[PDB]
Each structure stands twice: as C-alpha cells, then as structure tokens.
Amino acid sequence: NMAIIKEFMRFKVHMEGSVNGHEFEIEGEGEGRPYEGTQTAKLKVTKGGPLPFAWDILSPQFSKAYVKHPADIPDYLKLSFPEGFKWERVMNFEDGGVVTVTQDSSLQDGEFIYKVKLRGTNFPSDGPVMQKKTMGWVASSERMYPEDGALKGESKQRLKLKDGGHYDAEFWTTYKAKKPVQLPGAYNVNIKLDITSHNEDYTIVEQYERAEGRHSTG
Prior knowledge:
Keywords: Chromophore, Luminescence, Photoprotein. Belongs to the GFP family. InterPro entries: GFP, GFP-related, Green_fluorescent_prot. The protein is mainly β. The chain contains one helix and twelve strands. It has one domain. The protein has an eleven-stranded mixed beta barrel with strand order 1-2-3-12-11-8-9-10-4-5-6. The longest helix has 4 residues, at 76-79. The two termini are 28 Å apart.
C-alpha cells in the first residue's frame, strides 16, 4: 502492499527503563516486510550497560505493524497509520517478577518511530532473570480480541533456562489506534522471536521475529 505501509519498512526504537531499580536506555534500528510478517532489529545499550538482568525480558518490546494478516482479518494496527497507535503491557512471571511497558508508535519520514518505557520489579535476586539464566522464548500464540474500542491480546509465554527447565509468564496487552479504525474479531497471532546474535555482555543484540495472524488454533 500500500502507500502508507510499504512492502519494506524501517523503524527506529528508543527504550528507557528500569529493572529492579537498575536504570538503562537502548537505541535500535530495524527493518522488515510488514505484509510478510518478518522483521529484524539491531539494538544497542546506550545507558546502564552492561545490563545486570536477562535481555529476554526486553526482547518482546522492540512491533505489530509487521504481522502478516489474511485478507478477512482487519489489520487494525496497519490501518492506524500514518498517525499510529499506542500499547500497554503487563507481564507477570511465575516467581513474582513483573514488567509493565508502555509504547508509542508513529510514522515519520517514511520510517516507524517507536518509543518504549519499561518498568521491571520484584524479580528475586536469585531468580533466572537477575542471574541471566534464560535462553530465549519458545514459539507462542497471542489470542487477540476487540474490547472497549481497543485490540487486546493475551498469551502464555515460556522462557527456556540454562538448566534445561522453563520459566513461565502471562502477558496482557492493549493496543489502541490513535484514530477510529476497524477492529478485527477474535483471532490468533503465532509468533517466533529469536536472538540471532549478541556480544558477550548483551550490549549489542540482534533479533528476528516472524508473526502471522490466523483463525486456526492448530
């Protein structure tokens, strides 16, 4: 594909946040194919590095304009441009850790601009986040539904651990376009989020994500 959202699109992202009181900032740039549901990003820690916690709690915050949608499911977040949308998320981890996130997405000079604010709290000092024992997210499915003029998503998520175990979380997100555009019915978004490279201290990280909406639960 279209005039506003092109078949190849870049983005810039800024994150400011704190986890268990440790403040940091990240700047990154990404690119992808919004109609194909694929994207990559290159992130750099610009303040507060090296981070004393697992990168994996940050990785899901860096883009659902890049979800492949069939023609019969309205692509609410693409339709929100050029003005864009906001989102707010809660992640509750099974050991009491909590991350809350707010985000603004806009389009400027043909590139998406993402601004993220993040607060992680109550992570046990002994747990896998503060001890950097996580090893990426398993592939997941986000159940989407419209409610009160916004698009909501809920998912059960799981981190792999160095010890061969797992560490679970429940995510709740609300996505709201800045202008009335058409909301979809309920559907599922299948996501695979990969860390494709990083330096030793995770101050330089590259990610890849593939996301596609479907009716099927298979």
